[PDB]
Amino acid sequence: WRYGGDPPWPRVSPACAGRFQSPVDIRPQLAAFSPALRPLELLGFQLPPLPELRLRNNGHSVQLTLPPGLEMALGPGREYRALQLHLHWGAAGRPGSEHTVEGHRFPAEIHVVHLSTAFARVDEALGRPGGLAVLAAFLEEGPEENSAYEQLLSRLEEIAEEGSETQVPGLDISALLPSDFSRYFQYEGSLTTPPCAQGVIWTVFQQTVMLSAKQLHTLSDTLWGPGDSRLQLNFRATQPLNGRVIEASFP
Amino acid sequence: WRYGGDPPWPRVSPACAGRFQSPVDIRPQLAAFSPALRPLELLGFQLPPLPELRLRNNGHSVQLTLPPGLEMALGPGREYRALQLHLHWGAAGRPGSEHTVEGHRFPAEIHVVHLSTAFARVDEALGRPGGLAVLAAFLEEGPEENSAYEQLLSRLEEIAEEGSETQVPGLDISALLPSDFSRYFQYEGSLTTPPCAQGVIWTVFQQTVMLSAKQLHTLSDTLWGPGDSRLQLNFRATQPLNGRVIEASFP
Ligand SMILES: NS(=O)(=O)c1cc(-c2ccccc2)cc(-c2ccccc2)c1
Ligand SMILES: NS(=O)(=O)c1cc(-c2ccccc2)cc(-c2ccccc2)c1
Ligand SMILES: [Zn+2]
Ligand SMILES: [Zn+2]
């Protein structure tokens, strides 16, 4: 599989043809206020610098493999373990977030993928309701260099080639996310790459995180993918809600 | 195990001392309204008189085994298959519902236990979030004789003995349930018996079903359990929410 071209996503995995896929267009006016959605709780995201983490250009994204001990809770009794995070981005004057708001596509998006504590392995979780949970935040231009993002983006040159990887010091993973964990949209959907398995709980933050123009250019302009193509516009087309109701932690 | 004897419930299974158990006291004023909670969908519940169904006195309750084909959805793509129903009941003018509403205990409660379509086996679903779902309704005293319930209560004489079972004709299982499938409370808890597994979605109908005084006497006064003991007060004590918010399908 490779974005833009073919192989035919259903010909890879039949789940990429499901009715309840991600990403989606968030229309806040059609979102349902649910005061049961409490603030997200993160535990153990402030890493020491050793051991180092593996940052990889997998030719579809850049991903940071997270170590054991990062606990995330969607609520009381809704407990997850972080596995990894990766980015989606566009290109020179072209946004590349996966999710949209009222049709607005943002420059870029971070996904932090988690595994329900009820499951020891991803393959037991796939397609199971609540088995996987993803935290999604939009990346936008601000005036300052984001120092948490700088620790990853200053290493993209080392992993320009598809299939390249490098070691990076542990950092505050929570610092790649918005400070507001209270205000978010939540819906059920799928992985956004094969096998696009359903039952995924998506949490999209209202607050965005700020990168400098230079940071955003480094992300869009440094990596190569399948063949001699620039790794760019690495986002799936928006999928219809198909009668699903996005919830919001706020009216 | 027996209903709070010796038998130690945390001693049989220490899961009985988990943080997120059932049953709970429902406080409607404290329930979170989410317009995302759609009407319950129950298809295939109108069973023909044949094949006949196992009705059994397992010593702790009366259970009806349900055939394949009873399909239930809590939402879009949150689908379930009914396995069995059973009841909880009191004694001579003593209420025996498991759930309470603002401290009110109702005469009796019906549980219809379902298996997520994402799990082949009950034992894979136990302890996994949403693996099992139970539909719960309160049985109250009303002036009329209840036709759906008579089909089951009339056959209890035949299974007074612990371990005893009979066959009974197919009946409309959906006839045992209240009027409005759009009005319910919903939370995540546990089995109310050992092994007290967590990850159970409980859906508790707002409105009740009415049986005659005779019918509720038929139910409490006919069955025997462990020893020379009447099968009665087969309900667990109310458990704390520990931060869990009960949701409601109506404002
Ligand atoms: N976009 S996503 O959130 O649904 C997602 C993307 C990618 C992905 C990552 C890099 C490049 C290409 C795609 C990997 C996963 C994933 C699912 C389960 C376990 C681990 C990772 C999840
Ligand atoms: N009260 S309950 O809903 O939590 C409940 C669920 C199941 C149950 C049934 C099938 C599959 C899986 C779980 C069985 C019982 C039960 C009642 C009397 C004696 C023994 C067991 C009770
Ligand atoms: Zn992603
Ligand atoms: Zn029960």
Side-chain angles (χ1 to χ4, degrees), chain A residues 1 3-10 12-251, chain B residues 1 3-5 7-10 12-156 158-160 162-227 229-251:
Chain A
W1 77 270
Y3 302 92
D6 295 359
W9 273 27
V12 186
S13 173
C16 295
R19 185 169 169 80
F20 306 121
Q21 301 277 290
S22 301
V24 305
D25 185 45
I26 304 166
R27 304 192 65 199
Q29 283 189 342
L30 311 192
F33 168 57
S34 342
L37 301 184
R38 316 310 308 143
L40 304 183
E41 301 290 350
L42 270 58
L43 203 53
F45 274 64
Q46 307 171 89
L47 298 173
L50 311 175
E52 288 196 280
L53 302 190
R54 310 191 76 82
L55 187 68
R56 175 186 184 76
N57 179 350
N58 62 31
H60 303 116
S61 186
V62 57
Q63 67 152 17
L64 188 66
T65 301
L66 295 176
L70 281 73
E71 300 166 6
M72 186 278 287
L74 293 182
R78 299 171 70 204
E79 289 173 19
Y80 295 81
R81 286 159 189 149
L83 298 170
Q84 61 110 265
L85 63 86
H86 59 274
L87 303 171
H88 305 266
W89 66 83
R94 283 168 88 186
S97 75
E98 289 227 296
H99 288 93
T100 59
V101 179
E102 288 179 6
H104 181 74
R105 195 174 304 277
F106 303 77
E109 198 168 325
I110 179 172
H111 293 164
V112 185
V113 186
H114 298 76
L115 182 52
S116 166
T117 54
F119 295 103
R121 310 192 310 274
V122 171
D123 51 40
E124 318 165 330
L126 284 171
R128 271 68 193 271
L132 298 173
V134 185
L135 298 194
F138 299 121
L139 317 193
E140 295 188 288
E141 179 182 3
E144 293 311 320
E145 180 161 281
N146 192 303
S147 53
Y149 275 89
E150 192 54 30
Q151 294 188 53
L152 304 189
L153 297 174
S154 52
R155 304 305 213 91
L156 289 196
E157 214 192 358
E158 296 172 19
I159 61 173
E161 181 175 29
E162 169 182 30
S164 276
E165 64 184 61
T166 194
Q167 282 189 300
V168 308
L171 65 146
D172 186 356
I173 302 305
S174 86
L176 306 161
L177 292 180
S179 96
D180 183 357
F181 293 142
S182 290
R183 303 183 70 85
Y184 60 77
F185 303 100
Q186 199 165 91
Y187 76 99
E188 297 207 18
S190 76
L191 300 187
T192 69
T193 61
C196 308
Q198 295 189 351
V200 182
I201 313 292
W202 287 88
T203 306
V204 187
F205 289 105
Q206 191 177 47
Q207 190 187 26
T208 66
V209 329
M210 303 285 133
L211 271 59
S212 67
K214 179 195 168 70
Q215 282 182 317
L216 292 170
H217 187 262
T218 294
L219 177 60
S220 60
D221 184 68
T222 306
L223 303 174
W224 302 76
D228 231 81
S229 72
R230 286 203 171 289
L231 217 184
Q232 287 187 335
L233 309 158
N234 71 328
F235 65 84
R236 185 186 195 190
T238 264
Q239 307 292 303
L241 279 174
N242 277 335
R244 290 172 289 183
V245 173
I246 298 176
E247 295 188 320
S249 57
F250 58 94
Chain B
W1 63 276
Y3 267 100
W9 267 35
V12 165
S13 199
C16 295
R19 288 170 306 153
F20 308 113
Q21 301 276 290
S22 297
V24 305
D25 186 48
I26 300 164
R27 303 185 179 163
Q29 301 186 200
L30 298 185
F33 171 49
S34 180
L37 297 187
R38 293 336 295 147
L40 305 187
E41 288 178 19
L42 279 73
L43 300 186
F45 280 62
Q46 302 176 119
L47 294 180
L50 302 168
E52 304 208 313
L53 306 183
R54 181 205 211 190
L55 186 72
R56 169 175 164 75
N57 165 353
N58 57 35
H60 312 117
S61 163
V62 48
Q63 50 161 26
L64 193 73
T65 307
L66 293 165
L70 280 77
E71 297 184 12
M72 190 274 281
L74 294 183
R78 284 158 63 213
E79 289 182 23
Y80 288 89
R81 267 152 195 179
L83 302 179
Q84 59 128 265
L85 63 82
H86 65 265
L87 303 143
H88 306 266
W89 68 81
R94 291 220 285 254
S97 79
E98 292 214 293
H99 294 89
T100 58
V101 177
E102 292 172 351
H104 183 68
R105 192 175 302 281
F106 301 74
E109 192 169 328
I110 184 169
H111 294 166
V112 190
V113 185
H114 299 76
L115 184 59
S116 173
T117 50
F119 297 90
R121 308 180 100 245
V122 163
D123 68 1
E124 300 172 338
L126 282 171
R128 267 67 185 271
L132 305 178
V134 186
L135 302 184
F138 296 119
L139 319 198
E140 248 171 358
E141 185 195 313
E144 300 302 345
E145 176 119 318
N146 185 305
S147 283
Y149 280 87
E150 197 49 26
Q151 263 190 114
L152 295 181
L153 298 172
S154 68
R155 303 302 234 100
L156 287 193
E158 319 180 10
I159 63 156
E162 185 179 34
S164 235
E165 91 185 46
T166 186
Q167 302 279 292
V168 306
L171 65 153
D172 188 354
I173 300 303
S174 73
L176 301 168
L177 296 183
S179 179
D180 198 337
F181 284 9
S182 78
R183 293 182 84 81
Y184 56 85
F185 299 109
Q186 198 169 75
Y187 75 102
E188 189 172 313
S190 69
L191 302 179
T192 70
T193 63
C196 292
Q198 289 177 184
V200 186
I201 314 311
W202 288 90
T203 303
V204 178
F205 285 95
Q206 171 193 56
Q207 78 207 161
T208 71
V209 305
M210 310 210 284
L211 285 60
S212 79
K214 191 194 189 159
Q215 277 181 322
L216 294 164
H217 266 261
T218 303
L219 179 52
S220 36
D221 292 345
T222 301
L223 297 178
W224 297 94
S229 200
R230 313 175 126 257
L231 216 183
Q232 289 183 321
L233 309 172
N234 54 332
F235 70 83
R236 188 190 189 179
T238 264
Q239 303 295 312
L241 282 164
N242 285 325
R244 290 172 290 177
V245 172
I246 303 171
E247 307 181 64
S249 63
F250 56 95

